[PDB]
Amino acid sequence: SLKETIISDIHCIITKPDRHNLITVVVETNEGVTGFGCATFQQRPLAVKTMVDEYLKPILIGKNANNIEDLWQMMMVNAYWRNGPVINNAISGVDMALWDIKAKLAGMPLHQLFGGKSRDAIPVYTHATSDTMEGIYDLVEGFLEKGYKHIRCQLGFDQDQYMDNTLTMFKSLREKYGNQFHILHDVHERLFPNQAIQFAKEVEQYKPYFIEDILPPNQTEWLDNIRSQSSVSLGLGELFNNPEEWKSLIANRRIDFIRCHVSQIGGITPALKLGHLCQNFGVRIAWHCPPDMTPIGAAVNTHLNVHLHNAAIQEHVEYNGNTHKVFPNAAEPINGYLYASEIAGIGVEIDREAAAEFP
Amino acid sequence: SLKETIISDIHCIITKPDRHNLITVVVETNEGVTGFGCATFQQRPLAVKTMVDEYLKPILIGKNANNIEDLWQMMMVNAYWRNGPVINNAISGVDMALWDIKAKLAGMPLHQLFGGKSRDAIPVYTHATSDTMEGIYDLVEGFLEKGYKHIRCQLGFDQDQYMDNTLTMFKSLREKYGNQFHILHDVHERLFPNQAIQFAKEVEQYKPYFIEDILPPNQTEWLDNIRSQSSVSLGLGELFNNPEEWKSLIANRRIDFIRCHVSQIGGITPALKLGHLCQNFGVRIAWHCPPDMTPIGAAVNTHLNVHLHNAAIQEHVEYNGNTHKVFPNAAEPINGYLYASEIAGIGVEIDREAAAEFP
Amino acid sequence: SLKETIISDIHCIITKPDRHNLITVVVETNEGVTGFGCATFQQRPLAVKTMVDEYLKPILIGKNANNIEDLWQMMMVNAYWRNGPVINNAISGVDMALWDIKAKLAGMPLHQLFGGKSRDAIPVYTHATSDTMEGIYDLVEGFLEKGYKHIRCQLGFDQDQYMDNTLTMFKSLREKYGNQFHILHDVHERLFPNQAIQFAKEVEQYKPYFIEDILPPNQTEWLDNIRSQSSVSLGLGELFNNPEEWKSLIANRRIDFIRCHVSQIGGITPALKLGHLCQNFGVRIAWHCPPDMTPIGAAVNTHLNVHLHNAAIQEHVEYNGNTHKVFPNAAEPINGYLYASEIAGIGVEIDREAAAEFP
Amino acid sequence: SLKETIISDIHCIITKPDRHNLITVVVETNEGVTGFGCATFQQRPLAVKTMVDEYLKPILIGKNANNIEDLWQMMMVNAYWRNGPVINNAISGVDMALWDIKAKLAGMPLHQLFGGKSRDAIPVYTHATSDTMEGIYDLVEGFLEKGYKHIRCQLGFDQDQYMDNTLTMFKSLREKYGNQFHILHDVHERLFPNQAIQFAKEVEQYKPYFIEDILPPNQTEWLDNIRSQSSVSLGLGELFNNPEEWKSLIANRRIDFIRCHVSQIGGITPALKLGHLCQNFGVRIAWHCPPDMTPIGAAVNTHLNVHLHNAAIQEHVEYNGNTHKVFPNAAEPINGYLYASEIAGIGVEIDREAAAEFP
Ligand code: NA
Ligand code: NA
């Protein structure tokens, strides 16, 4: 007894209440049921907006929003060339908006629409980056006081100096805090493969929650060398926009955490399927939630994270007063956990007037 | 703005309006929102009913029906020993009922709840089994007249005689009908592996839609021998109740169609994830719909089949007048296609009074 | 000069002399030669009994008990759907009873019928589970005093706390007792695969006899990661009911001990063949003997364990006075060893009157 | 209630009632229960007899015959060097005799002791060898008239001429007899691997029951080349005496029929386990029964062949009147099938007086 949901208009609002350009996609329908979605391309806000305004919107107006995957498949192949940061982001904002419409139509929280909760809340990790161990302590202790139990620690913001200081960082952190928290670290592709394998063996004893981006970006074939000699947990996927980047990685158990950005791989639609894939292959899920993701994206990740069986942790995003003003009711971690929204829909929208104040 | 959905009661109704014992699971809730699900174990109707009545129902009463996967995971591990025909069927009827409740709560067709249609309808295949080619012609032509374009053909209802007659069947069917329809065939595990490989090479030229169960049941390792020499399309999975039976099969591209029964693998919850898995690995989907599946199961398969990207075809089930009476509004193929129900929920229930007439 | 042995009746007696529902299957024959077998499904006693009473017994009455594997193959495929906890248990009680009849007919101990002893007795392991190291010491020392040389030790009856305490348990046990006994530990599938590999490397130095269930249940593919980096001995198979669960595991040397329950995989008939398979591939055998296995099952495991070349150890089961009363002559470990029965048959039966006292 | 069975004496009788030296091993016991076994080494009758007389018999006298595998393992490693034609044959005669004793003790047919029949009888194949097609027809038609449905056909008793004539033989046989019988062929290792692969592809269309010994004897690695391009069924194992010869062959599905001689691999004890192994891996069983196997060996193969699930066919052995005289009650094929003996024991012994007449 759901009737066709006809797409009447599409907007793409960029706003700068804080450090970053924030991109919201707005899908309006004849019923006056409105959907909101998040795109995130700060280095390139304008490319995304053009892609939505005069390429996505023409092929969407008039369409039945009810059939989300149909509309997904159609957008994804429309330019013929496909898979990249600009297109997937644009499509992801619409995909998210379509899911939002469906959940409002269903009168339910987005994660309930998916099928319900696997857990009550998702743990959160924060970022401690400093040039000195003193600075990292200062930051760690403040996060501890707030209930966080996972913290990404980066000492220093040549390759040998970085590897040496980082092992010293892991060593001092275990000496000072033992097992009070899990320690995450992103290598940011700074190592040659031989250096990567060496570092994986040396850092193993310190039991990182995961080491992210330990290899240069098209050298994943070197993972088998690492995984045959080290038990170190590994995350990859942050810059992926293309299934070829994650398919063999996961089928071959070459990583422990997938770290894709939901908007970079095309939205909720592909995120659910990749979530199920991860569960099949025993890989955990830690989607990125960067500084320029809006409270709308973050709310979507929390819905994903209480629903998907293999979701492990959500990445923290601050929000200043401006941002909370532009996106009302944006949840914040309580004792180190993010709670899914409980009203119908995504549960967070953008205040268009407020977003005006901040062009 | 969905509130807890509290499970108030659970029933398991068996009925014999026709050839088979039909098993319906009924989940009632405080809101008076009622869910219906299908279990199918004709050789063993009673085992399923005991499993539901005094093992499932105790651990379910009081629970929040909203969290379907939570309740799935819990039922699946509850007996500690797990995965088999009796338990998965029992759990599948409840799983299906929980999905039904959620879709009614959402005021939407079950497949809309999933995320919408990938296609308008799913094609249907029928069964032509006879002891003589004359009998098979007679049956094929009646199906053709009704718009069917896929037909499973079985000539004869020793191994060498069966292999010889079957190749003769494929050969005569192509001579008589050319490409007017797709031809399916189930080998039913009747061949030794060496005979299987020989038959796969010989039948290739006749281009079956798929050959089902070509190997003895724990000899899937012989598939690589077949797939390195023959292009014949292969289906397996009919008797699977255990992920170990399908995980390596699909990851290694050893089959072309998965043929599991949705109720044997535990319900809609695992069916969606296996559907996504099949899409990832390029394997198509043809769930079994046996003679003792009710119109409730069949309606669920059609919802699955218009929604999941890789769904290929639905297996036909007759329904006599009795059965239509016990389960009102059960769809029937139109010009060789089954159309998903469009009212809220699964769209088919059981008339409890009518089911009374047929114990 | 053996004549047909005609099956005249079949019973399934459940009894609760102690903690658990105990299930005995009884096969009677025209000659008045009676067989006894054990089914074990405590979470689900009733499902098994229904399966025996009105599904197994009809297809068995009149049949020639002499042809055990014929009757095995026939029961196993009879429901068409196959392999699960309820059916295999039911079939296993009958299979065991058929073997019992044959051994009485032969006037010999069951293990002699198989072909004789490989060893004089099988060692036994016991269970020390407590919340504190003090409690585990207390329990270990009592087992030591009784001659046991293998003990499964469980400290605590989050994942990080469990892994930490368990390594502390292994470490304190080696410090206190050195090599006075072998230490077994069941991880019970509580770890993610990355945590499993880490734990396997860390626990290696303490030389467990085996670590059981170290992975989540459908993640055995992660075993190669473990086995390429750690020498830790591994057991799996406790919940298996399906050859697909053990075939590739053993052929690829992915475990060191098979831990299936003889009743869950269908009886003595499949146990002998899996025993031979284990010998071929260099895998040792440690069938489960849970708290609800009867003295009849236990006697069968001891016959299996003195006969099969690769049998390594038998799991201990208590028996209170009630149980000994219901099943007379049930052997008990002497100086840490179980001795096979030496009278004709299995050597243990059920006292039907006594089983009456305890419904 | 079986008591120790004490070995009192051991004999090895050679006899030449026909073409071949026939070797029977005799195990006597204090109870006066006597066992008979078959060794077959015609090229070397005397080596076997020495091995039994003054190496086996000393380590056997006094021993408990009840524990067959214990005594097997002990004999097999006794010389320290192990596995070859002379030792395994000697040990096989004793192993067979020990099984014979056990079956008489049990008052049952040997195959009943094993666990019963899988089938009522085993089909038989015969040998048609001639230098001309006329000669092969003559022979085939006589076998057909007698009810045989499987015949090994050899045309000619250089490599290119042999390959050419053999394909011509297969072609003419299909033209003349179509599918009236199965056609077996032994290549006898006469081909280089490249010629083997070519022949396997060319002979495929004629559907041999199997092609035996298609490769030179230590070139089994070339099997993967064949099996990736041809469906031709393959048998190997005739000269095997060493598990290394069959273990990887079967685990990797590189053959379809195992063709070992039971006496060459050490007796019934290893034959049962290899039978179970074959079943696991989907390989069928066709033990050799050469012209110098006695009616005692043949009776043992028939017991093996009605019992083991994967047994496919038994090789024919004539017996002239002399031989029937030396070994009374030796079964003969009826309408192309051999029937297992139904009296207690193996069911065939040697008449020592009669064997006297024929030194
Ligand atoms: Na290694
Ligand atoms: Na090929």
Curated annotation (Swiss-Prot), chains A, B, C, D:
| Residues given in the record as D-arabinonate binding sites | H188, E238, R259, H288, E315
Select a single GO molecular function from the record's annotations and give it: magnesium ion binding
Q: Which UniProt keywords apply?
A: Magnesium, Metal-binding
Gene3D superfamilies, per the entry = Enolase-like C-terminal domain, Enolase-like, N-terminal domain
**SUPFAM superfamilies listed in its UniProt record:** Enolase C-terminal domain-like (SSF51604), Enolase N-terminal domain-like (SSF54826)
Which biological process, per GO, is one annotated for this protein? amino acid catabolic process
- Listed transmembrane segments: none
Pfam families listed in its UniProt record: MR_MLE_C, MR_MLE_N
Residues involved in Mg(2+) binding:
D186, E212, E238
The record's similarity note reads: Belongs to the mandelate racemase/muconate lactonizing enzyme family. GalD subfamily.
Q: What's its job? A: Has no detectable activity with D-mannonate and with a panel of 70 other acid sugars (in vitro), in spite of the conservation of the residues that are expected to be important for catalytic activity and cofactor binding. May have evolved a divergent function.
Oligomeric form and interacting partners: Homotetramer.
Q: What is this protein called?
A: D-galactonate dehydratase family member VSWAT3_13707
Organism expressing this protein natively: Vibrionales bacterium (strain SWAT-3)
